[PDB]
Amino acid sequence: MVKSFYGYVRDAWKNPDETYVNELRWERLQVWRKQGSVTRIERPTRIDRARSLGYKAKQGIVVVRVNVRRGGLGHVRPNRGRRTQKMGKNKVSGGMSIQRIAEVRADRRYPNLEVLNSYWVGEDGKHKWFEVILVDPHHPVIKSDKNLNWVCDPSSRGRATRGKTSAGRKGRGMATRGKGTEKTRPSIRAYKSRGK
Amino acid sequence: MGKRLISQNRGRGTPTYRAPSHKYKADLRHPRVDENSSLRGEVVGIEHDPARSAPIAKVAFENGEELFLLASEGIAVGNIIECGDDAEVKPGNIVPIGNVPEGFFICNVESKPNDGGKFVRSSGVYATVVTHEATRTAVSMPSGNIKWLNPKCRAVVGIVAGSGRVDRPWLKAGKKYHKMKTRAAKYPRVSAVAMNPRDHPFGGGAWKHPGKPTTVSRNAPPGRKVGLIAARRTGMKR
Amino acid sequence: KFDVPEELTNKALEALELARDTGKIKKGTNEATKAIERGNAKLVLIAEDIEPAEIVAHIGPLSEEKKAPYIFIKNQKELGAASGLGVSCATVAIVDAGKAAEMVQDIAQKLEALK
RNA sequence: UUUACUGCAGCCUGUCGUUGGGUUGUGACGACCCUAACUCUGAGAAGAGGACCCCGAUAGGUGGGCAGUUUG
RNA sequence: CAUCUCAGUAGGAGCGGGAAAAGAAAUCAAUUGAGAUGCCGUAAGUAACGGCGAGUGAAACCGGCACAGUUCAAACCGAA
Ligand SMILES: [Mg+2]
Ligand SMILES: [Mg+2]
Ligand SMILES: [Mg+2]
Ligand SMILES: [Mg+2]
Ligand SMILES: [Mg+2]
Ligand SMILES: [Mg+2]
Ligand SMILES: [Mg+2]
Ligand SMILES: [Mg+2]
Numbered sequence: 001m002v003k004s005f006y007g008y009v010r011d012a013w014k015n016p017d018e019t020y021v022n023e024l025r026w027e028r029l030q031v032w033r034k035q036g037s038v039t040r041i042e043r044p045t046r047i048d049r050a051r052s053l054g055y056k057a058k059q060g061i062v063v064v065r066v067n068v069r070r071g072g073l074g075h076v077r078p079n080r081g082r083r084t085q086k087m088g089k090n091k092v093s094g095g096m097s098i099q100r101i102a103e104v105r106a107d108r109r110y111p112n113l114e115v116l117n118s119y120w121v122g123e124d125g126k127h128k129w130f131e132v133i134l135v136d137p138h139h140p141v142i143k144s145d146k147n148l149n150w151v152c153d154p155s156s157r158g159r160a161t162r163g164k165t166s167a168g169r170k171g172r173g174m175a176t177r178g179k180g181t182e183k184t185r186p187s188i189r190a191y192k193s194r195g196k
Numbered sequence: 197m198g199k200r201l202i203s204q205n206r207g208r209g210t211p212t213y214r215a216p217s218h219k220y221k222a223d224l225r226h227p228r229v230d231e232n233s234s235l236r237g238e239v240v241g242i243e244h245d246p247a248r249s250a251p252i253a254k255v256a257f258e259n260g261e262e263l264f265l266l267a268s269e270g271i272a273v274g275n276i277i278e279c280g281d282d283a284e285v286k287p288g289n290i291v292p293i294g295n296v297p298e299g300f301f302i303c304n305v306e307s308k309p310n311d312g313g314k315f316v317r318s319s320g321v322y323a324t325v326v327t328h329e330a331t332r333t334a335v336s337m338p339s340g341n342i343k344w345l346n347p348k349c350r351a352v353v354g355i356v357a358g359s360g361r362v363d364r365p366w367l368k369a370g371k372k373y374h375k376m377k378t379r380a381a382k383y384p385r386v387s388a389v390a391m392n393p394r395d396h397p398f399g400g401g402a403w404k405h406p407g408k409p410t411t412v413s414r415n416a417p418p419g420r421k422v423g424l425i426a427a428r429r430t431g432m433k434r
Numbered sequence: 435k436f437d438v439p440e441e442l443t444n445k446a447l448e449a450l451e452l453a454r455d456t457g458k459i460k461k462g463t464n465e466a467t468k469a470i471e472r473g474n475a476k477l478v479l480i481a482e483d484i485e486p487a488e489i490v491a492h493i494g495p496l497s498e499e500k501k502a503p504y505i506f507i508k509n510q511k512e513l514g515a516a517s518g519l520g521v522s523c524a525t526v527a528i529v530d531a532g533k534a535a536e537m538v539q540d541i542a543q544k545l546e547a548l549k
Numbered sequence: 550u551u552u553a554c555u556g557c558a559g560c561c562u563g564u565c566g567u568u569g570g571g572u573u574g575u576g577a578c579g580a581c582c583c584u585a586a587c588u589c590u591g592a593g594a595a596g597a598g599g600a601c602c603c604c605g606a607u608a609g610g611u612g613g614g615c616a617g618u619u620u621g
Numbered sequence: 622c623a624u625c626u627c628a629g630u631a632g633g634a635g636c637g638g639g640a641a642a643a644g645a646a647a648u649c650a651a652u653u654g655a656g657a658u659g660c661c662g663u664a665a666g667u668a669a670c671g672g673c674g675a676g677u678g679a680a681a682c683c684g685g686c687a688c689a690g691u692u693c694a695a696a697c698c699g700a701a
Contacts, residue, residue, distance in 0.1 A: 004695065005467040008492035024487055026569085026586070033587090045486050052694040070567090071605040077558050077615085079197065084556045084617055084623065091606095104635080124586095125567025126604055147693060158636040177657095178648045182680050186643035186659065193629045197615060231595065308590070308597050346597070393550070397614090400550080407550095417559040417614040465699070519700090 006048035013046055029124055032065070038109040039065045044131055045121045053117040053133060053166075056148075060139030062113060065121065066102040066130050095196055098128050099167035103160040106132035113137070114151050115160035118167060172196060198394040201419055202382065215380030220247040222264035225312030226290055226304070226350055227257065227279060234280030235259060239273050246378045250319035250358030266304045266317060268354035279350075287354035293333050294347030296325045302351035305335060309348040316351075320359030323351070388422065397422055436548050438505060442541065446479060446505045449537050450516050450526055453477075457532025461517040463490050466527040474529035475502030477538050481510035481524045490524045502527075503542045 012019050028045075044050035044063050055061060072093025078086070099118055107115045113134035121131045136142055137151045150156060159165055163172050173184030173196045183195030206213035221243060229235060237257030243264075245252040253267040255277050265277070271288045279290040285297065296302060301322040304313035315337060316323045326334035332344045366372045369384070376383035393400030397420060401407060410423035411430060424430060453459045460469040469475050470493070478497045484490045497504045507513050510522035517526040531538040 002468060002471045002696080005463045005489075005492060006695075008467065008496070009488045012488055012492065020491055021488070030586070043486065046488065047486070048694085054693070056693095069605085079615085081616060082557085085625095087557050087616060090558080093606095108635090123567090150692090154638060155641070157638095161636040162642080163636095164642085172642095174643080176648085177646055179680080187641095190642075198613090200614095228591070230593095310591070310596060312590090348596080413560095413611080415560050415611055417612065419559090419614045420612085421614090460699090462699085468697095 006051065009046060009048040013049070025122055029122060032067070032122065032129055033124075033127070035065070035067070037067050038106055039067075041065055041131070044133075046119065046131070049119045050131070050133060053119060054148075055116075055133050056145075058141055058145065060136035060142035060145075061116075061148075062110065062134040062136065064106050064110065064132050064134060066106050066118075066132055067127050068098045068102045068105070068130065070098070070123070070126055070128055095171065097167060097171050099130055100160070100163075100165075100171055102128070102130035103132055103165055103167060106134060107158075107160040110134050114156060114158075115165055116151075117165060201396065201422065202385075203422075204419055206382075213380065213382060216378060219378050221245050221252060224248075224252065224264060224266045224304070224317070226306070226352075227261070227263050227265075228310070229279055232281075234278065234282055236279075237263075237277045239271060239275045239277065241273060242267060242271070248317070248319060248358075249361060249375070250356065266313065266352065267357040268303060268352050269320075269357045269359060270354060271357065285353060288352060290350050290352050292348050293325055293335060293345060293351050294328065296351070296353065298325050298328060300325050300353060301355050302335070302353055303356045305345065305351040306349040307345070309346055309350075311349065313351070315343070317356060319361045320356055322355035438545070438548060442544050442548075443505065443507060445537060446477065446541050447507070447512065447516050449477065449531075449534050449541060450479060450513075450528065452534035452537070453528045453530070453532055454516070454518050455532070456534065457528070458530035459517060460527035460529060461514075461519065461523045462526075463493065463524050466493060466525040467496065469527040469529050470497050470500045470502050473500065473502075475500065475527045476531050476535075477528035477541060478502050478504040479513060479526045479528075480504055480506050481513050481522070482506050483509035484524050493525055503545045505541070505545060 012021055016022060016025065032039075041063055044055060045065075047055075050063065055063065073096060075089040075092055075094075077089055099120070103115045103118050106118070107113075113136050116133040116135050118130045118132040120128070122129045135148060135151050137156070142148050143152060156164075160168065163169065169175065172188055173181060177185070181195070183191040188196050202213075222245075224245075227235060227237075235257050237255045239253050240256050240262075241254045242251050243254055251267045253265045253271050254262065255265045256262050257277075268288050275288060277288055277290070278284065278286070281292055281295060283289050283291045285291060285295060285300070293302060293305070302325060303316040303322050305315040305323055306312065307314045318338075321338040323338065324336040326336050326342060328347070331347070333347050333349075334342050335345055337343050373383055388396040388398040389404040389406065391399035397408070398406040398410075406423070411427045412421050412423050412425055414421075414426035416425075450459065460466055466475070466478060470478060475497060478493065480490055480493055494504060510524050513526060514521050514523035517523045528538060
């Protein structure tokens with residue numbers, strides 16, 4: 001088993017409760033809770049995950065940690081007449097996942113980049129921290145980079161807000177094909193939102 | 197949706213129910229002192245605090261920090277105020293209650309150490325130091341509860357100045373109106389039976405009556421918890 | 435673990451310099467792990483200033499069960515410079531000691547002695 | 550409007566997560582002690598609580614506070 | 622009339638271009654086959670759902686418009 005060290009990082013992060021990642025988790029969440037909603041970091045907390053998701057060690061790529069509240073879409077009780085099925089909102093969690101929420105907040109704070117992907121990095125009772133990869137589509141290195149130069153196209157600006165990232169496509173019910181995607185692909189809006 | 201109660205309007209925070217915060221002299225709290233530190237100060241004047249209708253003492257300390265203080269009874273101009281554990285147990289002094297002898301009167305008591313003073317602050321109220329223990333100390337509060345406080349909770353020795361303020365009957369709606377001008381409270385208040393049923397739970401009917409028991413449960417929702425809230429009992433002492 | 439002597443760390447740094455001059459060295463955590471697994475690690479130097487900790491946290495037990503001695507360097511700037519680069523290097527692996535083989539084996543003896 | 554019908558907020562409480570370490574009493578349960586997460590105070594040194602509370606989810610209750618209806 | 626329907630409609634917030642989304646199977650089939658996606662016709666008011674009430678309601682096969690396939694992570698090399 002001549003395995004790269006990225007494999008060892010992935011092994012350490014496969015079951016993080018029963019590895020050395022638990023000690024680092026207890027030491028790291030103290031610093032992470034104090035930080036802001038969208039915090040920039042030097043290196044990704046899990047380098048193998050970022051590299052498989054598309055991170056490269058070059059300028060014009062930014063990695064940011066985002067804190068998102070745990071739980072579903074907290075909603076307001078309606079103050080006007082509802083038919084008793086559209087009146088209850090405590091047991092309603094929306095169609096926006098927390099990963100999409102974190103990606104959209106990272107895209108909001110960093111307007112001149114694009115959200116590439118993101119991955120779970122840690123969590124506690126009240127928060128979920130996600131590390132979001134962003135790309136600079138106007139840096140010359142990304143312009144020259146042929147494996148990232150698709151992002152310079154006009155159709156790629158606003159990926160995380162048009163549901164084009166991997167968490168976005170998962171949330172739009174496009175992880176699979178065949179049966180079950182009769183009302184999701186090619187878009188939720190195409191079938192009057194009946195899928196999802 | 198029958199109209200929200202006066203308590204819900206007050207909790208929303210409208211100008212009718214907001215305190216006129218610009219009228220008040222200053223927030224009252226004990227001076228900030230580091231642990232194992234002390235400061236002296238002298239009274240430069242007894243003023244009038246509109247927030248409490250009682251006097252407050254303007255104290256100039258040794259570091260030059262002019263700080264308004266809650267005035268205990270008997271404090272005068274040119275008196276020296278001392279703070280810290282090493283401060284003598286004297287009226288007007290700020291000391292821990294763990295050094296105060298049992299049976300003394302204290303006021304402006306702190307809930308926690310270095311709190312600034314929460315309990316015993318109305319005009320004339322006081323507390324009694326009951327017992328001393330290693331981790332605790334008992335103080336008999338103005339209500340009557342034997343509250344257990346930390347031994348390091350500071351307090352100013354003596355009863356709060358302005359005692360006897362409620363002895364005078366109001367005697368006139370204008371006098372209470374003028375007091376309530378500087379308050380946050382709503383004046384005058386309409387009885388709930390006189391309201392229509394949309395406004396209060398107790399309103400409505402051909403004749404003034406609640407129609408339902410005035411003792412409401414503790415588990416009532418907001419906008420229903422009126423009347424006698426969660427009463428152990430009712431009526432005068434039979 | 436017993437803390438290694440500072441003189442032993444200095445000898446390991448000079449051994450890395452001489453290996454760079456004469457023999458073969460694998461600089462970086464990826465190449466260090468490959469050299470450890472393949473069975474060529476004459477000496478493994480680790481940096482104690484890694485962030486995140488998952489970069490070189492596997493190197494210790496892996497080298498310990500692959501029979502390759504390891505040493506902990508204080509931080510990675512002089513590890514990178516001593517390993518011939520102007521950047522950091524979280525670990526370097528010595529797989530061909532060259533003309534510094536005897537100092538490397540004495541370093542291994544001292545590491546096992548104070549192990 | 551209500552002890553009409555069906556619900557929905559709020560509130561109360563069990564369980565899971567947040568959530569750790571040692572001790573006894575039992576076969577994982579209850580209590581006790583600690584600081585180290587966490588909470589509150591202060592500009593901070595630090596002080597007070599502390600694996601409780603708050604919070605996410607789930608189960609039951611109360612619930613004209615509120616909604617939609619019925620009342621041939 | 623409450624599940625349902627009205628209807629994911631009306632309305633709202635974000636993003637965005639001349640188009641956008643989709644897109645090259647962890648697919649659909651049936652005993653053996655096909656070979657990215659979109660859109661059109663049909664399957665069909667059929668399967669399916671439903672106080673099995675009122676109503677809602679596809680896809681595959683198939684016939685067409687148009688035809689397009691690939692790039693990363695990793696193994697090995699190591700600044701090339
Ligand atoms: Mg924000
Ligand atoms: Mg496209
Ligand atoms: Mg009412
Ligand atoms: Mg009603
Ligand atoms: Mg209706
Ligand atoms: Mg625009
Ligand atoms: Mg695609
Ligand atoms: Mg429908």
